[PDB]
Design a protein around this ligand. Sequence first.
Ligand code: K
Ligand code: K
Length: 357
Amino acid sequence: TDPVPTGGDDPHKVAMLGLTFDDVLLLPAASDVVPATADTSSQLTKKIRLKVPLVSSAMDTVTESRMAIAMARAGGMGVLHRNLPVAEQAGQVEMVKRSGGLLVGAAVGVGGDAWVRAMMLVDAGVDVLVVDTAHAHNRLVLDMVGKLKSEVGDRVEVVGGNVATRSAAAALVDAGADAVKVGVGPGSICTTRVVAGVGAPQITAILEAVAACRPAGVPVIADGGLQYSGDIAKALAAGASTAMLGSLLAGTAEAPGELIFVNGKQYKSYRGMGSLGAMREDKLVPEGIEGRVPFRGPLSSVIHQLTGGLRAAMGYTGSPTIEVLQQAQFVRITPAGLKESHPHDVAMTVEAPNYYA
Ligand SMILES: [K+]
Ligand SMILES: [K+]
């Protein structure tokens, strides 16, 4: 436990120190890898390996069929959002399936209606069902995962989330999950940690979930909080097998929504699925906000920047594969270390394709 005395007589009350992406850097190591020779393939689930270890979020401002098609063509996968009627979601799965036999996932909730939705998605040819919940360590979520796996698990892979602890990941593994999705609160548009006061910083959440999942051979999906290509490398080094992205993809041409023009600039709508506008869950109050992000152009170019940065990280850490990157070491840093990591003491005059102010 956290050794430092911070009050009371119970040393387990404050149980650990949580780190997130900006708290760590990957240490370079001996290398015979250059970005060109790195292999970025990685398991999405026990049975499915992607060429690029990225998936798009199941949000109504990120992933519909156009995004799912573009993600699969880029070597990743999209998870179709579930904020729409069951027949429309199933229709979108079909749209993706008839664009080349591309991989696709789709989100479902828990309960009878979610069950009907799942069954329809499976009939439509979905490859991955994602049981998409705020708190997967609730007994009802574990049941849903276990039952889908029992009924359709031969035909479809079943992902469960979200979790932020070792015990929750362990419960999902025991329920038969084919992958575990980690992230309680880190999302750019999420307010769970603020309105409920609940969560775990994302690097520690990954390390803890992986401590349960890795020995069981179950891939971890790092969901939320990623803003730069280097964050993907950190998530994967912490032990995740793939990263799920919302904000980084919401600004692309393929994300749903029309372009927003404000003050000579271009934006796209991006909102939490727990935001008032989205709910319109078991929630009594919202756990997200509604906002906008800058327009970033074609998905393909964004993914090229992200995989290029990941490949650089693999070259620096001497990792020929994602499986080796998962063994890399971190150094913890201070606020000055973070300031030093970004550009500092200079005015940027030109935008970089992989770095914005
Ligand atoms: K947040
Ligand atoms: K720097």
